[PDB]
Amino acid sequence: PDHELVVCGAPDAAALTGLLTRVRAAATALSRPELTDLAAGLAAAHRGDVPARFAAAVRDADGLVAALDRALGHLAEGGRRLLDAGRGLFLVVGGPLRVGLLFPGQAAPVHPVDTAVAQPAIIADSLAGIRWLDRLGARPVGALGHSLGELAALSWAGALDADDTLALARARGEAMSAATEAPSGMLSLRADLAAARELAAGTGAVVAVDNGERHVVVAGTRPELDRVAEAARHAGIEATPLAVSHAFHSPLMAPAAEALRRAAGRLPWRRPERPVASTVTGAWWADEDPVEVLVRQLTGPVRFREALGLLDADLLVEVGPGRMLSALAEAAGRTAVSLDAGAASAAGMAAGTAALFAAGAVDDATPFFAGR
Numbered sequence: 001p002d003h004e005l006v007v008c009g010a011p012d013a014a015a016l017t018g019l020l021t022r023v024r025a026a027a028t029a030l031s032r033p034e035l036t037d038l039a040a041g042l043a044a045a046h047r048g049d050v051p052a053r054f055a056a057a058v059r060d061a062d063g064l065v066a067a068l069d070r071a072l073g074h075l076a077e078g079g080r081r082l083l084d085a086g087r088g089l090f091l092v093v094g095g096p097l098r099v100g101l102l103f104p105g106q107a108a109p110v111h112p113v114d115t116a117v118a119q120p121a122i123i124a125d126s127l128a129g130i131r132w133l134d135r136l137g138a139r140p141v142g143a144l145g146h147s148l149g150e151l152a153a154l155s156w157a158g159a160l161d162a163d164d165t166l167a168l169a170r171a172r173g174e175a176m177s178a179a180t181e182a183p184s185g186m187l188s189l190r191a192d193l194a195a196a197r198e199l200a201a202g203t204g205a206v207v208a209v210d211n212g213e214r215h216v217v218v219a220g221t222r223p224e225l226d227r228v229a230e231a232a233r234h235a236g237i238e239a240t241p242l243a244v245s246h247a248f249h250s251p252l253m254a255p256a257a258e259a260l261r262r263a264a265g266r267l268p269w270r271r272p273e274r275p276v277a278s279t280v281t282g283a284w285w286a287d288e289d290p291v292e293v294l295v296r297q298l299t300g301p302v303r304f305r306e307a308l309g310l311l312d313a314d315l316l317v318e319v320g321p322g323r324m325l326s327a328l329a330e331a332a333g334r335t336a337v338s339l340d341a342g343a344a345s346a347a348g349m350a351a352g353t354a355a356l357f358a359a360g361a362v363d364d365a366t367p368f369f370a371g372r
C-alpha cells in the first residue's frame, strides 16, 4: 500500500506517552519494509480493550515521526482528543467516540458516465466497504446515504441483502437513464435553502439537493436553469452548472417510477436493524415502506443537511468510492474521513481504518496487514 497504518495503545495517557516516545525512537530512519514490520507488529500487539489509542495513516517513517510528535505534543499539554481527518491522524484517550457512516451517491468516482453503469459500480464499491466494516466488527451509531447511497445504508442496516441491493442498483440505474427527454440538468448554488427557493421561485426549477448552508443544487429543463442562472447573477449568488445530462431529484424523473416500483417490489425487504437517517424523509427511518420511499426519492429533494444533523457523531466515515460526502460533512463543520472503497490508492483505507480504531469503533487493525 502507498500509506501504512500505524496503531497503538496503552492503559492510560501517561503510559501512551511512554509508548509513543519509544515508537518514535524506533521509527527514525526505518526503511519502508522495516516500517511495515513495525506497523504489523504494533497492530498484532495492540488490539482488544485498548483504553488510550493512537492511529495514523503515514506515507513513510518521517510521516510517522511527524504524527508521533503531534500526538506527543498534544498529550504533553493535557490534550485527550486530536482528530485530524485531513492528515489521517487520530488520538483518543477515554473513548469510544460516536462514529457514523456516510454512503455516497453518484457523482461518486466510477470504479458524463452513464448512470446505468455508474449506479451499480458505486454500490459494488460501497458493499465492499461494508464487507470491510464487517471483517473489522465495526460498531457505528448509525448511517446515512446520499441519493443512491440510501440503498447501501439500507443494506448496511440489514433491510436488504448485498446481492439484491446490487441487483436493485442495476435496475435503478437503467430506469433513471430511461426517463428524460427534453434537455435538462442541475445547477449548484453557493447559497442556503431559502436563498435557492427565492432564486427558483416562479422559474420552473426546483430544489434537487440540500447539502448545507452554502450548497443547494436545483434541477430543471435548460430554460428553467437559465432563469435561475440569470437571477443568481443579478443577486450575486455563485451558480455552477453540473456536468450531468439529466435533472435528477425532480419531477422530470417521474417516468422512472413504474420500472423502479416493479424492480423494488419483488424484493425481500426487512425492517432495518440499525439506525438510518434518511435523505428522502430527512428523518430517522421508522418503519417506512421502502418501495414507496425509493419511488419518491426519484422526484423529491436529497435532504442531506437534515439527515446529517440527526446523525449525532463525533467522527463520520464515508464508506464508498471518492470523498464527496466527507467534503460535504466538513463543509458543515463535522469531522469526516473516507475509506475511498475500490480506489487504486490505499490512502483512504488506511486513514478510515485509523479513524475507526482510534475512535473505538473497531478493536483490531490486523486485517490491514493480511495477504500483502
Ligand SMILES: [Cl-]
Pocket: 366, 367, 370
Ligand atoms: Cl483479520
